[PDB]
């Protein structure tokens, strides 16, 4: 199963190799970037809330 | 050097029988000791900042059979 | 203690700070010499119209180039090691005083005999008597006999402090759980002013040390009076 | 389009550009902190009140100027821009790790800013000595956020160091040796070696400090069995390698600038430069306890350590005298970067000589934590490293941007920069000799006058960097181009034009041995 | 492909002097004004 | 390094506006927060 | 127990396949080894192949010399080293 | 005797800057002399000089803490 | 085109995503130790595992399916891992220096002897020698695995890597089960602090090595490794030899000497 994935990944589509599989790599890349953006903004919200006293 | 069957023979003579023999040796020496009587030491069982899991006094691997709290043991 | 427009060090009272001052003059003369070399060469060799921009012998001057800074560093380092070994003799002291650096104040124990201890806090700026010094005057001055070897054991209760008097040439770390030793002597009586040199919180500027050095009979009278 | 070019970038020039931008921003943050410090020390009295907020400003000034101005700009920016251009490589070996190192840097900056914002404050000095940095004096989250800032910056610089060593050792043409490379390549090789050899020591040290703070260990608690002298040992075992890291790519930059603008084909004594840089790198690892001459060590230990300072004084003397020796008979072109390099030579000589005065433990009894130390480290850092950053920036701003700076404004900027730093840091020698300790928010009256003079000098340096910003804008307000560069045959980075294209060295260099 | 040439290898446009002057002064002024507002924050706390 | 004549050359007045813009944009916020410290100390 | 593990003469693909196929005939089109056919005269110059109209050429024209000197070399006749004068000629046809 | 003890002397076995081990070992040596000649039953005050050594050398907070832990029975030193 | 034999990487998000993931770990530890929040920390841990999975999966795609891995590239990756290993040497050496400075001169609060009074140390001749022998046997089995890889044996390789992985799992669960039933805790002075920090960091590194061995196994069962271009398995052998010589230094330093 390696030489036929070798045929699959040697394509001149111009797509980067982390969107070359089509659907599922695009799906978990989108979910990864969405959850890390949400985590970053909730991290800044948490840091700003911790900066203020009670 | 750079053989393949001689390394299988080497591991099947030395490594796994040695680990099995040491496992039997640690099995015949698998015996617990009694609980030592408790002295409230000061450089042992410190509490400066409480732990951030569960209650705050228990450690992460605190087995109550052997590990003492600063205020004695648990019953 | 310091006066306005002071350039050099505070002058010496202990013998140790006299040898430190003489060595400082020696090494600063050496620094002036080699800075004069560097400055005069860089002023010289950018101020010509002659040029030489071809292949040059890479290794033909390196023996003098290597032995001159080595011999000047040896000439620096030999009196450095001499005065470095001049602070670890057999002391055979007369008095032993213990200092503990508490949280932004000092505490003093004269407990060789008839245990005596007190605390030193700064006299505040609004509560200064006329003529006194801002940020350098304490409640209880720390009284010692003069021209005698005095052991001074320095520690702290909680954090890192630095018991320092510059004019006597003393600066020793006050480390919790650790007892460092200094020796202090004098040649003149009077008041000597130092302050903390290690970062110790929000009033780190606000702990001074005042060493009042008096004769032996007046130190005995003061020790009998304070107990 | 923008996101793939800059946020997802995988070539060295873009990452070097982002280094230059981030380090300029962080440097101006540090400059604001320095103006705040000299504003507290200007007149007697408390402009800010307590010493806690002043210590917060001092620690913030130290971390922001060390790990976020000289470190990323110097090592990352100049290495990423020039090292694959000097050795003729198309890119770095691991460009994704280089991009990760950049993008870990502003998390570390945000964590440092949040450490400053939390009401406890990390007012400990840049030495994070316990038990002051424990959970008793600083019970709070400021010291922990500081520790994680140092963790993130350390991981960034280990990744960059690994990438730099593999792209220098491996990505050369197969005919060139290691002794045919330019001098800045050697400086960043040795810098990356000491970076990955020194950074895990402070990583372990602040990890144990964190577990002492929040996991109830007694690594540095004297009431449990430890001692803070162990922390001092690990911290300075990193710490003197760190300042040699701060100064070595500056040595490479000034060697390149002095070689170029004098007209020379090569620096005088290339083998002497290479030997002295590896000697400084090898010998900075065994000199750390000159930072603890008052902790109460053995007298034999401090004798060994001051001898170690002398034998580390000799090879940088070889370097500075050979920098003098490569000015011999050269067509001295009076460029602004030449003025930065000559100011580097003189002021770094003065700072090193004051360090040699400090190197004697006998006088380090007197001058420990006074302002004499502050004058020493500012005459090396704030003059040598800053002047080398400015020399590299002025020399390679045609390469990075494509436009040439106005040299008249650059000479004026050097003039007021020199006046400002020299008037800032020369009375600190007298304040250290008189006996003002470090970390003080208020001083006695006898230290007033020099402090007043010193405060004035800081504002002049502000004017310097203010007009520096105008210089950059003036280049982009002029859009004057470059037809040609002189001495383009010896220097490889000038051979593709100004600025070089995105894809360089697709057809690599042709060099043969036989 | 990405732009190659003078002034285009930068993450910001340089085609106008005045908006780029405003960009530089707000970027470096935010840098210069961050620690001052931090010091204002711990003074305003207590 | 040779330099081309400027494609969009600035004059003296625009450089004066530029230096005044840098000075005012750097001295309004820091100067404003330094102009009253005792107001933050609950005057 | 037999083979099973493939050798890299059929499994390896792409650029690794290209350099392995070309390198077994003594050819290095992808520049991993220092080049050959060295003579500085104008009748037998130092030949350099390319895929474009010019190439950066680095001369170490005497041994134990630190600074390589770099110069662009274009098509046409044999240009010279800009301090020693060894002749370099460009033949841009390789792949 | 060795009395008229003005202060602590220069101990050649511990001549460096750190002086924790001097007062620590002198306090345990005083207690060990007390235990040894209480077991012997003789004049236990002949090593009273050793007592005055820790009067002069390490601070009264340390001595008070050590007295408290030896009164409760939480002394890590083996006496 | 491209005539240099170096590898040009496509634009990549996992620098940015892993960097902000590390930011989430640092802020999660701060919000856990001081404000007791788990959610940001777990979000960061998920972001690391997703970022590292995507990154190393794509490095697998370039190295195996697209053939960008020249000998110059493998030499560069070898240099990079060797430098990472040397960095971890100096990390564990800092921990060793902490333990040696702690135990060389015992302080007065401990009583002046190592071990301190009130603790019962683990004597080395019981079941720690079993886990030293387990790591040694795993090193021998991975050396047989590497030699069967170079020779061209497949089923011998599968048996060897399987026994290597299960002895690594046996080692980490044996260390964990012993540290359930140890007689002293993290708050039991400098001995407990040094011991538990050193053994916990070694346990984290051996579970990292076990995970790297597992992904090496599932790569090998999909025929990724050829007869000579098998740098992932060479990496597994190098990191495994690293982790058990580190454990040999821990067993000599802490368990045997002074206990
Ligand atoms: C629609 C608007 C037009 C198109 C977009 C351009 C404008 C917005 C932008 O993304 O603009 C581009 C961005 C670029 O910034 C970045 O891409 C990331 C910067 C990261 C800074 C982090 C700071 C700390 C943050 C955490 C606290 O610029 C900035 O936002 C400010 C840059 C100001 C000029 C700086 C000059 C520096 C001169 C000295 C170095 C020269 C190096 C030459 C080489
Ligand atoms: C750029 C960074 C840099 C550099 C290069 C150095 C270089 C040196 N440093 Fe320094 N140092 C710091 C940054 C740096 N330092 C910092 C940031 C601190 C503060 C740490 C703290 O907070 O405590 C510090 C602290 C510091 C101390 C602590 C003082 C104290 O705590 O009381 C000491 C002790 O002597 C010291 C010594 C030296 C020495 C001996 C050198 C030498 O390498 C200098 C040699 C350089 C030269 C240029 C001289 C060569 C020139 C010649 C002409 C030849 C001379 C030959 C003869 C005289 C014969 N440094
Ligand atoms: C990189 C290191 C660095 C630099 C540049 C500086 C620069 C300056 N430092 Fe700093 N300083 C330290 C590192 C540095 N310092 C450290 C490490 C301490 C010890 C902290 C402690 O006690 O723990 C310290 C301590 C320190 C104190 C001690 C406070 C106290 O203890 O009471 C003081 C006050 O006088 C001070 C002042 C200054 C001043 C007035 C400058 C001026 O030079 C400011 C002017 C600098 C610049 C303007 C930077 C140049 C940048 C540019 C020109 C822009 C670059 C951008 C491009 C090229 C695009 N410094
Ligand atoms: C009086 C007249 C002048 C005398 C001149 C000669 C003085 C020589 C002093 C040598 C002291 C050596 C010593 O004990 O070093 C301790 C150091 C060890 O110190 P350390 O690293 O163990 O210090 C830690 C100390 N504690 C644990 C207490 C915190 O030994 C060495 O560095 C190696 C052996 C000695 C090497 C001496 C070489 C000196 C020249 C440098 C060449 C390189
Ligand atoms: C530049 C040279 C290198 C840096 C020198 C730093 C040390 C320094 O400036 O020391 C001050 C020095 C000695 O001071 P001193 O002569 O004792 O002052 C009292 C009577 N004039 O004072 C002098 O040398 C004179 C005043 C400074 C001259 C410069
Ligand atoms: C913590 C962060 C760890 C990041 C990491 O391990 O990255 C591995 C890195 C990714 O692969 P890389 O070589 O950068 O890809 C470009 C060309 N192949 O792989 C490498 O850079 C090669 C191996 C280096 C390992 C470094 C570990 C830290
Ligand atoms: C008021 C500040 C802005 C003044 C602007 C100005 O007068 O610009 C004229 C000149 C422009 O530079 P110029 O001398 O023409 O060219 C460099 C020659 N190599 O500007 C300068 O050279 C700088 C003169 C600034 C005077 C103040
Ligand atoms: C801790 C951080 C550092 C961990 C160790 C990193 C090791 C990196 C090794 C080098 C990476 C690399 O680029 O290797 C190249 C290789 C592909 O080349 P090759 O194997 O030769 O292909 C054969 C084709 N015939 O590519 C590879 O082998 C990369 C794919 C395998 C990498 C797997 C990494 C596993 C890491 C496990 C621990 C993760 C910890 C964080 C997440 C869990 C947290 C609880
Ligand atoms: Cu005590 Cu500063
Ligand atoms: Cu140093
Ligand atoms: Mg100190
Ligand atoms: Na003030
Ligand atoms: Zn030639």
Short mmCIF file of C-alpha atoms in Angstrom, two decimals, chain G residues 4-90:
data_model
loop_
_atom_site.label_atom_id
_atom_site.label_comp_id
_atom_site.label_asym_id
_atom_site.label_seq_id
_atom_site.Cartn_x
_atom_site.Cartn_y
_atom_site.Cartn_z
CA UNK G 4 9.72 -9.09 3.65
CA UNK G 5 11.54 -5.82 4.35
CA UNK G 6 11.83 -4.08 0.97
CA UNK G 7 15.06 -2.69 -0.34
CA UNK G 8 15.09 0.95 -1.40
CA UNK G 9 15.57 0.20 -5.12
CA UNK G 10 11.82 -0.09 -5.78
CA UNK G 11 10.10 1.47 -2.77
CA UNK G 12 12.04 4.75 -2.80
CA UNK G 13 10.42 7.42 -4.97
CA UNK G 14 10.77 11.05 -5.93
CA UNK G 15 13.99 13.01 -5.47
CA UNK G 16 15.62 10.13 -3.55
CA UNK G 17 14.85 7.88 -6.52
CA UNK G 18 16.27 10.51 -8.89
CA UNK G 19 19.57 10.87 -7.03
CA UNK G 20 19.86 7.10 -6.50
CA UNK G 21 19.23 6.38 -10.19
CA UNK G 22 21.59 9.09 -11.45
CA UNK G 23 24.28 8.46 -8.82
CA UNK G 24 24.76 4.79 -9.73
CA UNK G 25 26.16 5.83 -13.13
CA UNK G 26 28.68 8.31 -11.70
CA UNK G 27 26.44 11.31 -12.40
CA UNK G 28 25.56 14.03 -9.86
CA UNK G 29 22.99 16.38 -11.43
CA UNK G 30 21.74 17.46 -8.00
CA UNK G 31 25.10 18.69 -6.64
CA UNK G 32 26.05 16.52 -3.66
CA UNK G 33 29.77 16.04 -4.45
CA UNK G 34 32.49 18.57 -5.41
CA UNK G 35 32.88 18.93 -9.18
CA UNK G 36 35.72 17.84 -11.45
CA UNK G 37 37.46 18.60 -14.82
CA UNK G 38 39.72 21.29 -13.38
CA UNK G 39 42.07 23.33 -15.58
CA UNK G 40 42.41 27.09 -15.63
CA UNK G 41 43.61 27.69 -19.19
CA UNK G 42 41.50 29.43 -21.80
CA UNK G 43 41.46 26.42 -24.15
CA UNK G 44 40.40 23.96 -21.42
CA UNK G 45 38.42 26.05 -18.91
CA UNK G 46 36.58 24.94 -15.80
CA UNK G 47 33.22 23.72 -17.07
CA UNK G 48 30.07 24.42 -15.08
CA UNK G 49 26.59 23.16 -15.99
CA UNK G 50 23.35 24.98 -15.28
CA UNK G 51 19.65 25.18 -16.02
CA UNK G 52 19.55 28.99 -16.30
CA UNK G 53 21.45 31.80 -18.02
CA UNK G 54 23.91 32.38 -15.15
CA UNK G 55 25.37 30.76 -12.05
CA UNK G 56 27.22 31.91 -8.95
CA UNK G 57 30.79 30.56 -9.07
CA UNK G 58 32.98 30.45 -5.99
CA UNK G 59 36.74 30.40 -6.51
CA UNK G 60 39.26 29.13 -3.99
CA UNK G 61 42.10 29.78 -6.40
CA UNK G 62 44.92 28.97 -4.00
CA UNK G 63 44.82 26.37 -1.27
CA UNK G 64 44.57 27.10 2.48
CA UNK G 65 42.74 30.32 1.60
CA UNK G 66 39.93 31.50 3.86
CA UNK G 67 37.77 33.78 1.73
CA UNK G 68 36.13 32.21 -1.29
CA UNK G 69 35.42 34.88 -3.90
CA UNK G 70 32.07 34.69 -5.67
CA UNK G 71 31.16 35.96 -9.11
CA UNK G 72 28.29 35.58 -11.54
CA UNK G 73 29.05 33.60 -14.69
CA UNK G 74 26.81 34.02 -17.73
CA UNK G 75 26.54 32.31 -21.12
CA UNK G 76 28.93 32.86 -24.01
CA UNK G 77 32.71 32.78 -23.74
CA UNK G 78 34.90 31.91 -20.75
CA UNK G 79 34.95 34.53 -18.02
CA UNK G 80 37.81 34.65 -15.53
CA UNK G 81 38.22 34.62 -11.77
CA UNK G 82 38.26 38.26 -10.57
CA UNK G 83 41.65 37.91 -8.87
CA UNK G 84 43.43 34.85 -10.35
CA UNK G 85 42.11 34.52 -13.88
CA UNK G 86 41.29 30.82 -14.08
CA UNK G 87 38.82 30.37 -16.92
CA UNK G 88 35.25 29.28 -16.17
CA UNK G 89 32.75 28.49 -18.93
CA UNK G 90 29.00 27.87 -18.59
#
